[PDB]
Design a protein around this ligand. Structure first.
Ligand SMILES: *[C@H](C)[C@H]1/C(=C/c2[nH]c(/C=C3N=C(/C=C4/NC(=O)C(CC)=C4C)C(C)=C\3CCC(=O)O)c(CCC(=O)O)c2C)NC(=O)[C@@H]1C
Ligand SMILES: *[C@H](C)[C@H]1/C(=C/c2[nH]c(/C=C3N=C(/C=C4/NC(=O)C(CC)=C4C)C(C)=C\3CCC(=O)O)c(CCC(=O)O)c2C)NC(=O)[C@@H]1C
Ligand SMILES: [Mg+2]
Ligand SMILES: [Mg+2]
Ligand SMILES: [Mg+2]
Ligand SMILES: [Mg+2]
Lengths: 305, 303
């Protein structure tokens, strides 16, 4: 009975919209909340305002046809693919084939739709967009990693490597802030590099003194700190106050090891809201940190020569 | 127009012929169509021909669609489209849960629906396969990266690389060819199954690179040859490779500083093999990582 999917139906026949709603009720696996529009314009507003999990789109509407509609649909950057199923007229398959090249996941012929066919198409559209998104992110993640490896092979300057790392990581994660924290001999730390958008307070020029001496045992042993919400993570009053002071709400911290030594931290922040850090994100940061370590070893070995 | 192999499993010869006609109407693709009238024969043809898609009748004399699916032991995904009777949709839903990509209602089949379903099945299996490959590929690269971070031992790094790339590619042989100062070559490491004649300790000395100095490889040339016999190589080159049962060959240069240090080579020895962009890019990235390990070992030596 709990809503498990939201579907937007855009179709100028109210009776057909009601038919598809009923058909969806037959699905034992999901509970659908259905948004309804009779015009392309209202359908676009509902898509933008309410983010449905899938769309059933009539190939012909009073104000737009399906192709014009698809063209105006902007996906979220979180999922740059459109969970759209085109419903086309009998004998009009060719138009629907064009709709798939333009981003639709599937199509149905209006007259031949059964409850089962509908559940199938909707299931498929949602699953396929999820699959396309996963593949998309792997390609991006491999690009970022491969780029750092190339810079190291080319023996480029450490500063450029850190800068590329912080920028590309922030862009990939869509994070509010990413920075590199370097430990000095006296076990003090300074922020060396920062990439920050509009959501956080810049920290590069506003840092005082601060813990590595006393509890970097975990960082030295390569462990990461993943905090979804600073208020529910059980930190000390001081630590929470410090992070809140810079509007940090979620915190992901990965150590940078040079040989066996704790050189610094690669840190990611969300400042706008809590954020659950995901396995693929954590693995990427860990791999980048390892690469930074390799770059550090290169620079030191190069220095001694 | 790309070629596809499709397997039809249906005990009605007239239905098989209808779907064959329907497929030929597709102007985008060229179909080689295999046919079976029994599930048991359909299973053996699937095993022998690895078709791009399968049309599977929900009711066969020896097996039903679900039993057939259960017996398909391929981490691949199955490009199977189930064909079910009207009113038997419940069976088709079960098939979707059991690995089928799509289903069609026999009475309702049009040429267009058939093309849509076949395309979707193939495209979807392709997505899942690529995702799988990207995940495996990242593991190999990450492992090498960890090894470089943890050690200067060039041999262990080279060894891990050869073993993992071979395993990932399911290739018959992978080896590392290192150049001597005079650009003569030696095989330093080899990973080989049973399909090829081992080339370490079975040395063929070659001087071809003393002459040219691998300059084409030094500026990054990669060689990706699917079939040594049809690639337009010289009679001699072919003969040397034929001697070691090499059938397909993939060669990626290893660069140390700006110098051609050696070659990372992969061979297929049982059959021709088209090397894929993802595979070629993985080998380049690894060759680049080897370069980093080489550079590190050199800067270390100097201290
Ligand atoms: C409270 C008594 C004191 C204190 C405690 C404290 N600090 C940390 C961890 C970090 N402190 C960071 C300091 C900086 N400096 C910056 O410029 C900056 C942001 C711009 C920060 C966040 C710092 C980078 C860390 C890293 C880990 C993190 O959570 O961000 C901790 C946590 C230790 C642990 O391992 O849990 C504590 C308890 N800091 C003080 O200044 C106090 C005197
Ligand atoms: C014909 C005149 C002779 C000849 C030609 C030849 N060889 C190459 C390239 C390679 N030769 C390789 C030699 C080795 N040694 C091995 O132990 C071994 C496999 C186990 C081989 C393959 C060698 C590694 C290469 C690298 C490129 C490759 O194809 O593997 C070439 C040119 C290749 C190109 O693309 O230019 C030629 C013309 N080798 C002989 O022994 C002949 C006398
Ligand atoms: Mg209409
Ligand atoms: Mg369908
Ligand atoms: Mg039958
Ligand atoms: Mg599909």
């Amino acid at each position: 009975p709990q809503t498990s999917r939201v579907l937007l139906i855009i179709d100028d026949s109210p009776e057909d919209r009601e038919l598809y709603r009923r058909y969806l009720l037959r699905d034992r696996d999901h509970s659908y909340t259905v948004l309804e529009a009779g015009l392309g314009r209202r359908g676009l507003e509902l898509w933008q305002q309410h983010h449905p999990d899938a769309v059933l789109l009539d190939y012909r509407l009073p104000d737009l046809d399906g192709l014009e509609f698809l063209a105006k649909l902007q996906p979220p950057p979180q999922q740059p693919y459109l969970p759209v199923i085109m419903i086309t007229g009998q004998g009009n398959e060719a138009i629907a084939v064009q709709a798939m090249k333009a981003g639709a996941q599937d199509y149905l012929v209006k007259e031949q739709i059964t409850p089962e066919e509908l559940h199938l198409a909707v299931n498929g559209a949602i699953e396929t967009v999820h699959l396309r998104t996963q593949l998309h992110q792997r390609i991006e993640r491999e690009r970022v990693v491969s780029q750092i490896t190339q810079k190291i092979h080319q023996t480029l300057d450490l500063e450029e490597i850190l800068q590329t790392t912080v920028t590309e990581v922030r862009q990939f994660l869509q994070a509010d802030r990413v920075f590199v924290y370097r430990f000095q001999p006296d076990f003090s730390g300074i922020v060396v590099l920062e990439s920050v958008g509009d959501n956080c307070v810049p920290v590069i020029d506003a840092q005082v003194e601060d813990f590595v001496e006393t509890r970097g045992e975990d960082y030295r042993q390569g462990r990461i700190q993943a905090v979804a919400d600073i208020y529910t993570a059980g930190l000390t009053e001081c630590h929470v106050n410090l992070l809140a002071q810079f509007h940090i709400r979620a915190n992901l911290v990965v150590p940078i090891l040079h040989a066996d030594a704790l050189w610094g931290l690669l840190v990611v922040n969300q400042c706008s809201a809590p954020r659950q850090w995901q396995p693929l994100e954590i693995d990427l940061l860990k791999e980048l940190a390892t690469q930074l370590g390799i770059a550090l070893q290169q620079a030191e070995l190069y220095q001694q020569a």
